[PDB]
Design a protein around this ligand. Structure first.
Ligand SMILES: [Mn+2]
Ligand SMILES: [Mn+2]
Ligand SMILES: [Mn+2]
Ligand SMILES: [Mn+2]
Ligand SMILES: [Mn+2]
Ligand SMILES: [Mn+2]
Ligand SMILES: [Mn+2]
Ligand code: NA
Length: 327
DNA sequence: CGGCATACG
DNA sequence: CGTAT
DNA sequence: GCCG
């Protein structure tokens, strides 16, 4: 009834087991802070399974036969159903380790490895990092200066304003170039942590060298608070606000039109959906998938795709629109 | 037991 | 090392 | 942590 891969099942943005999935995702996050990518994946997959169910889980027996639910995840759900709370989850929530690793890793420019080292050095707060800025990278300094704004949800209202701005700069850098909204907002989210745009041009090859020209024009407009030949740009935009402005994370990506379907698919997510899709492609179909193409290692050939529908078909999967990829 | 997605900056 | 979905 |  429930397939084992998230790419084999529709997962809507809103669902009927929110509390249960949120608890499992706490344990997944904590596993990541401890370097256990395997446990993170299992908890993430178990959480996604509940997101895909057609109704709320009310009894433990309803977990029988569901993929990725073993002793541990079942016990988590058991306690939530019996007591409305799971002791392990609550112990994680209030642990100093979890709170600090979450605070640090959410800084733009700080990963698990950096946060862990800082935690081992005794650092605990953002001000602890601001006291010794000589140890920070320019990227981390930007993420720390703008941390407050970057922790505020981006609204879909903000997205429309940014896209018009980006299209203006793209139109001058290369007439005919297009801008496509991707990421969580393409999946239907009403809020997000950043805005993701995919840029291409209908004439293969014309997109070459495009991103530097876009960035130069955005910077000349005074809209870039931070940015690093290249095809991905992780920036911080100055977004006008009522009588002021706020910093917003924006990702700009360029792909040739031949690769656009694969880049659209990859950058539309979700992260778990794409991991599962690539795992499915390799393990079940023997094909190698990334945001550039789909490769048959036997014939040593790349699949030509004109649309996302093409890609799902070449993997033998039923098509899922972006709104059903919220794994 | 091995595997766990796959890139770019 | 960071970043992305 | 779970699947195959
Ligand atoms: Mn256990
Ligand atoms: Mn009990
Ligand atoms: Mn995003
Ligand atoms: Mn992004
Ligand atoms: Mn490339
Ligand atoms: Mn093992
Ligand atoms: Mn993300
Ligand atoms: Na970070």
């Amino acid at each position: 009834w429930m397939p084992a891969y998230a790419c084999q099942r529709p997962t809507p943005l809103t669902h009927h087991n929110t509390g249960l999935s949120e608890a499992l995702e706490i344990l997944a996050e904590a596993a990541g802070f401890e370097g256990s990518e395997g446990r993170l994946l299992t908890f993430c997959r178990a959480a996604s399974v509940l997101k895909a169910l057609p109704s709320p889980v009310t009894t433990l027996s309803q977990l029988q036969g569901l993929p990725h639910f073993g002793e541990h995840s079942s016990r988590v759900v058991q306690e939530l159903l019996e007591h409305g709370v799971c002791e392990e989850v609550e112990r994680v929530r209030r642990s100093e380790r979890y709170q600090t690793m979450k605070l640090f890793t959410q800084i733009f420019g700080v990963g698990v490895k950096t946060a862990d080292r800082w935690y081992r050095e005794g650092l605990r707060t953002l001000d602890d990092l601001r006291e010794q800025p000589q140890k920070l990278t320019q990227q981390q300094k930007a993420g720390l200066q703008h941390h407050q704004d970057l922790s505020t949800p981006v609204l879909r209202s903000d997205v429309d304003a940014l896209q018009q701005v980006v299209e203006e700069a793209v139109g001058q850098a290369l007439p005919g170039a297009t801008v496509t909204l991707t990421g969580g907002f393409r999946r239907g989210k009403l809020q997000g942590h950043d805005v993701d745009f995919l840029i291409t041009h209908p004439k293969e090859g014309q997109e070459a060298g495009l991103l530097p020209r876009v960035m130069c024009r955005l910077q000349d407009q005074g809209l870039i608070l931070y940015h690093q030949a290249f095809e991905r740009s992780f920036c911080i935009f100055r977004l006008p606000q009522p009588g002021s402005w706020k910093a917003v994370r924006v990702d700009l990506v360029v792909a040739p039109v031949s690769q656009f379907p694969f880049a659209l698919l990859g950058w539309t997510g979700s992260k778990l959906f794409q991991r599962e899709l690539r795992r499915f492609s390799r393990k079940e179909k023997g094909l190698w998938l990334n945001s550039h193409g789909l490769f048959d290692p036997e014939q040593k050939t790349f699949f030509q795709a004109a649309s996302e529908e093409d890609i799902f078909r070449h993997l033998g999967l039923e098509y899922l629109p972006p709104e059903q990829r919220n794994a």
